[PDB]
Amino acid sequence: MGLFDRIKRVVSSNLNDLVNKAEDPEKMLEQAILEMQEDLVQLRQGVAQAIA
Amino acid sequence: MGLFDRIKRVVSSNLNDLVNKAEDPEKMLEQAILEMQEDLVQLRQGVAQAIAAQKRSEKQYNDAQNEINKWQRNAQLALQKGDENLARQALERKKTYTDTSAALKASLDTQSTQVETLKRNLIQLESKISEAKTKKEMLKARITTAKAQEQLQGM
Amino acid sequence: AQKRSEKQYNDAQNEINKWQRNAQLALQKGDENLARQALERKKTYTDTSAAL
Amino acid sequence: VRGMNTSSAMSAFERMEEKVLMQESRAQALGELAGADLETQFAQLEGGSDVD
Amino acid sequence: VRGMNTSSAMSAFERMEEKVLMQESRAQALGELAGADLETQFAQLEGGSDVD
Amino acid sequence: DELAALKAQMLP
């Protein structure tokens, strides 16, 4: 029972540390921008295959 | 007897030390919000699978009906042909399929009711998470003011 | 935080107005189902706005 | 012809089962989006406009 | 539905209640201290009279 | 009740 309580505290501490460290508006958006474009390309390839 | 009582006291003391470290609301709240959404997604995925399973069952049921129709056509063809043997095979296939279809339909109806109940539950769950999200902003505002007061109090 | 809350409150009012427009549209449409969804949304939002 | 435990026959059956299951899974996710009133309402508005 | 301690919803509510009560109490205590210092309050009243 | 209100609005 004690371990479960400890895990929640550890998770909360880890989560709090994690959000602050990785929260950059410019960096996150750029990565996201690259990802959506890549996804679109994959979709386009599938469409091309269907066309083929 | 004494040892058991002592263990409970030790556990309580240990619990008190642990909660204080994780007492702050913001770290716990953010984790909880992430967790409920994940739980909802898992529930949704399970529901989707169940819905897909029902669709597959319906497709199978539809296929069985089509199969029965095909068998019926063969039976009709057999009569035109005049061969008794062809007709006999078709009849046996129709009876087993009908029984299977009836069982599937009954199962589907029970499943459908459960899905409808699940959908209603999902909507309620969706409403609850939104309310929680709104609460954090309200919680944040009061907390910030309290922190400011402590600094003011010292002066 | 207060400004954000005010913005959220303003957004909620705008959201309610949008919902009201949909409800008005539903009456013109003549479909009962569209109207029902709008009404539920308005009540919860009003309570939240009052609390805020 | 047999549809026996042959290597080619087994693969086709498994593949057939997977695609059908995938389509059903996709439909269920799609259905939730479809269920919402706003999506349905937009289509109705478009149809009236198209007729005019 | 169970709303057990392990579930996230139950945990959030208990922590929030303790924090909210404690925060409010601290603010109230600060106000009480201000009330105790009558001279400071008197000075503000004098300033208001001067402004008038 | 909402349905009844909607119905009332609909008649004019």
C34 touches chain F (CB under 8 A): no
DSSP codes of every residue in chain B: -HHHHHHHHHHHHHHHHHHHHT--HHHHHHHHHHHHHHHHHHHHHHHHHHHHHHHHHHHHHHHHHHHHHHHHHHHHHHHHHT-HHHHHHHHHHHHHHHHHHHHHHHHHHHHHHHHHHHHHHHHHHHHHHHHHHHHHHHHHHHHHHHHHHHHHHH-
Whose structure tokens read 């295959």?
A: A49
CA A50 to chain B, closest CA, distance in angstroms equals 25
Method by which the coordinates were obtained = cryo-EM
* Distance from chain centroid for Cα E6: 30
Q: Which residue in the set B11, B15, B26 is minimally distant from A16, CB to CB?
A: B26
List the single residue in B25, B36, B139 with the smallest CB-CB distance to E8: B36
Q: Give the per-residue SS3 of chain E.
A: CCCCCCCHHHHHHHHHHHHHHHHHHHHHHHHHHHHHCHHHHHHHHHHHHHHC
With contact defined as 3+ CB pairs under 8 Å, the chains touching B are A, C, D, E
User: Measured in whole angstroms, how far is the alpha carbon of residue A16 from the centre of its chain?
Assistant: 16
**Cβ atoms of residues C16 and C46 within 8 Å:** yes
Q: How far is D19 from chain C (nearest CA, A)?
A: 35
Q: Which amino acid, D25?
A: S
End-to-end C-alpha distance for chain E, whole angstroms: 62
Give the Cβ contact number of residue A8 at 10 Å.
19
CB-CB under 8 Å, B56 with D32 = no
Question: B42 is written with which tokens?
Answer: 């898992």
Distance from CA of C2 to the nearest CA of B (A): 7
CA distances to B52, B76, B92, E13 from B79, rounded to whole Å, are 40, 5, 16, 75
Which amino acid does the sequence have at F6?
L
Q: Which residues in chain D have Cβ-Cβ distances shorter than 8 Å to B47?
A: 28
Closest CA to C41 of C8, C12, C11: C12
